[PDB]
Design an enzyme around this catalytic site. Structure first.
Site, PDB file in Angstrom:
ATOM      1  N   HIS F  17     -13.797  51.374 -16.726  1.00 43.73           N
ATOM      2  CA  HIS F  17     -13.580  52.225 -16.053  1.00 43.73           C
ATOM      3  C   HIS F  17     -13.995  51.956 -14.504  1.00 43.73           C
ATOM      4  CE1 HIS F  17     -17.823  54.593 -15.366  1.00 43.73           C
ATOM      5  NE2 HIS F  17     -17.924  53.120 -15.488  1.00 43.73           N
ATOM      6  N   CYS F  36     -19.658  50.927  -8.312  1.00 47.08           N
ATOM      7  CA  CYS F  36     -19.077  51.625  -9.290  1.00 47.08           C
ATOM      8  C   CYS F  36     -17.422  51.966  -8.891  1.00 47.08           C
ATOM      9  CB  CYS F  36     -19.672  52.734  -9.692  1.00 47.08           C
ATOM     10  SG  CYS F  36     -21.405  52.707 -10.365  1.00 47.08           S
ATOM     11  N   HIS F  42     -15.218  48.019 -13.787  1.00 45.69           N
ATOM     12  CA  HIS F  42     -16.337  47.365 -14.595  1.00 45.69           C
ATOM     13  C   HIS F  42     -16.702  47.858 -15.857  1.00 45.69           C
ATOM     14  CE1 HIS F  42     -18.023  51.080 -12.633  1.00 45.69           C
ATOM     15  NE2 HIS F  42     -18.847  51.245 -13.551  1.00 45.69           N
ATOM     16  N   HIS F  44     -18.924  49.000 -19.790  1.00 43.70           N
ATOM     17  CA  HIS F  44     -20.372  49.338 -20.411  1.00 43.70           C
ATOM     18  C   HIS F  44     -20.136  49.393 -22.058  1.00 43.70           C
ATOM     19  CE1 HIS F  44     -21.564  50.750 -16.715  1.00 43.70           C
ATOM     20  NE2 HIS F  44     -20.540  51.424 -16.476  1.00 43.70           N
ATOM     21  N   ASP F  82     -12.850  53.654 -27.822  1.00 42.64           N
ATOM     22  CA  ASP F  82     -13.236  52.023 -27.928  1.00 42.64           C
ATOM     23  C   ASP F  82     -12.294  50.998 -27.707  1.00 42.64           C
ATOM     24  OD1 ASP F  82     -15.087  50.195 -28.923  1.00 42.64           O
ATOM     25  OD2 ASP F  82     -14.186  49.963 -30.707  1.00 42.64           O
ATOM     26  N   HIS F  83     -12.823  50.057 -26.712  1.00 37.12           N
ATOM     27  CA  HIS F  83     -12.127  49.022 -26.197  1.00 37.12           C
ATOM     28  C   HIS F  83     -10.853  49.343 -25.353  1.00 37.12           C
ATOM     29  CE1 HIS F  83     -14.689  46.342 -28.427  1.00 37.12           C
ATOM     30  NE2 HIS F  83     -13.983  45.205 -27.759  1.00 37.12           N
ATOM     31  N   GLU F 127     -24.842  55.319 -20.782  1.00 38.17           N
ATOM     32  CA  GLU F 127     -24.051  54.380 -20.118  1.00 38.17           C
ATOM     33  C   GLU F 127     -24.569  53.092 -19.913  1.00 38.17           C
ATOM     34  OE1 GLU F 127     -23.839  54.151 -15.633  1.00 38.17           O
ATOM     35  OE2 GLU F 127     -21.872  55.240 -16.196  1.00 38.17           O
TER      36      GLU F 127
HETATM   37 ZN   LIG Z   1     -19.913  52.734 -14.636  1.00 35.74          ZN
END
Ligand SMILES: [Zn+2]
Ligand SMILES: [Zn+2]
Ligand SMILES: [Zn+2]
Ligand SMILES: [Zn+2]
Ligand SMILES: [Zn+2]
Ligand SMILES: [Zn+2]
Lengths: 138, 138, 138, 138, 138, 138
Positions: F17, F36, F42, F44, F82-83, F127
């Site tokens: 995101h 961010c 980036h 997680h 997911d993914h 996160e």
């Molecule tokens: Zn983040």
């Protein structure tokens, strides 16, 4: 997100009863209950406050419609309890001592069956102005 | 598992008092307390609601026996407070301002010493019909 | 650590209103609200209990000074609401249905603006002795 | 008064069990429990967090002496449970399905027996790192 | 209104201490604290989780800007505590036993000083992976 | 009645995101979101704990059949999330900043849709191991 509030409605009913556990001796009963054990009974004008909780509807402004709540209370309290002898006219107390604690529990169960899931929040019963029981389903 | 409920009993007592902190100037006192600072005092018919919580006994149907609760309240409120001058007749207020907040705290401590561990739930004190303090041991 | 308690003050005001959502047909309105939909309105003597919470001051013995609380309530409830027609004299209800739920929310918001951060705990409004709404900012 | 805090101690034990209800047919048990119904059992390294709450003692700075808490847990958890087969080695599970929920309840009960009234706050049981149950006496 | 959530940030610090009460004789201290009373001290890699609560800001999607939360914790925790000897390097513990409970309280106080009124929700301190204390301002 | 407990299941998902508000200028976004806000994003490995609460079924010993809970989470979390790239692959985040707080809210909403009324208790989203958000429907 909608706002949430608690809506309460108070109702009253007159009923008769005698505190007596058949699972105790006549001697113990008189000791535990004393005057409330009067063989011919006694009675009270009970005041019941029923509290519902939920979202305040955005168009209607109500947590629940008063007419619906009124009707639920008529069926769950007034109908079975008003002008009755608790230990003799209502099946539930044939095995249960008619203390205000059990009256509060009885009313809670009755309402739970009638009300939408999660609406019921609290049942408050005044057996007298000075004797109150609050049941929250615990 | 047994069901749990809250049992309340209301009691009343008449008492006299004057709001005044010796730790403040006569000028500040009059400013903070105003009329309640009347040198000769004034008084109230206080109403106290004490709430106990616990399991509803399976045979007796009670959270607590009313006679026991009555007696506890007699010793913890009536005896030391009824028809007394708070600041002059009860040792506790010799150092504490007799506000309704402190009256609620005093009653809570008294009861805590007398009651079984974890029974006390709330102490509500009406200094007047419009002035109420609730203390829950916080 | 200082002790914490809840301080309540009850106030009353008389007001007029009619329950009616312009976002519904005259037929639906009458169905949803019934008698409360009376075109010329009706009214109530509302009772409001405002509860504040905080530490009991160690020298003053108060959670909050009654005079300050009185004044806050005068500005937040009495001034805008007493002897008024809710739907016609107060801007807030021009778009909101004047149910007791919304009256409780209105009073809560008014007080929130006036009171110190975190002081307000609950707003209880009796539209009648039997119809009560509790709003806790949820 | 004294500040109140929660003290938690984590303990781990190894045990085996089989999820099986004698009130369900062989076929329902497979359907309801799947792999956990494997006839010869399976096992887990259970992790248990026990939370106590109370006032921080003013002199020792402790809610409870950890040594006492350790002994309590050796007794309530380690001795009856460690390196055992739940369904066969602990009489409690003779008639109770050994779900993580029932392990938490069992542990809660064993602890209430040993601990001071009001001390126990929560029991958390990790059956696996992904399946967790929290019981708070409700 | 706006939704409310809790934001937690975990931080870790290294420190040494010795559990010892000057109100207890040399012999009572050994008995009460055991190994933690070792005259020359011992140490821990303390892990601290700080939980904040508030409304999710409608534009940024944040309960609190993490950058602000980090600075707050550098100040309230890292600077006074990291790589220090608790009993000798931080004046607070000059007269307070350095139990995990008191470390949690200390941290809570340092945070209330810096943070917006009402923001702080909970402080959790892991002295070891097995000994945890949670303080919520009670 | 039946005892009540909380059942939690942990799930993990991988996603990317970029924190960016279209209501903020390019310069404010950098200032508010810092790293961010990296234009290309980036990611997680998010960890999600879903807590359910209810009565422990008297025959199966379960608050909820884990198989049902797994399916619920595959649907509410794994499939849409997911993914994926949060801001571009899930329409919900088209107009909502993808903060951990909003991910928790989104998940809570998806779950309330599938789960029995009253079952969902809490949603916890990690996160990173250091940034955690808990949403409880407030
Ligand atoms: Zn983040
Ligand atoms: Zn009676
Ligand atoms: Zn007075
Ligand atoms: Zn009306
Ligand atoms: Zn298993
Ligand atoms: Zn140590």
């Amino acid at each position: 997100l909608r706002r949430r509030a608690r809506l309460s409605r108070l109702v009253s009913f007159s009923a008769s009863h005698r505190l007596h556990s058949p699972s105790l001796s006549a001697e113990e009963n008189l000791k535990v209950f004393g005057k409330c054990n009067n063989p011919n009974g006694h009675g009270h004008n009970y005041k019941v406050v029923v509290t519902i909780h939920g979202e305040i509807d955005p168009v209607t402004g109500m947590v629940m419609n008063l007419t619906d709540l009124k009707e639920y209370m008529e069926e769950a309290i007034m109908k079975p309890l008003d002008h009755k002898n608790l230990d003799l006219d209502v099946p539930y107390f044939a095995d249960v001592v008619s203390t205000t604690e059990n009256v509060a529990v009885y009313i809670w169960e009755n309402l739970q069956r009638l009300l939408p899931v999660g609406a019921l929040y609290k049942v408050k019963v005044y057996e007298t102005d000075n004797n109150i029981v609050v049941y929250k389903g615990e």
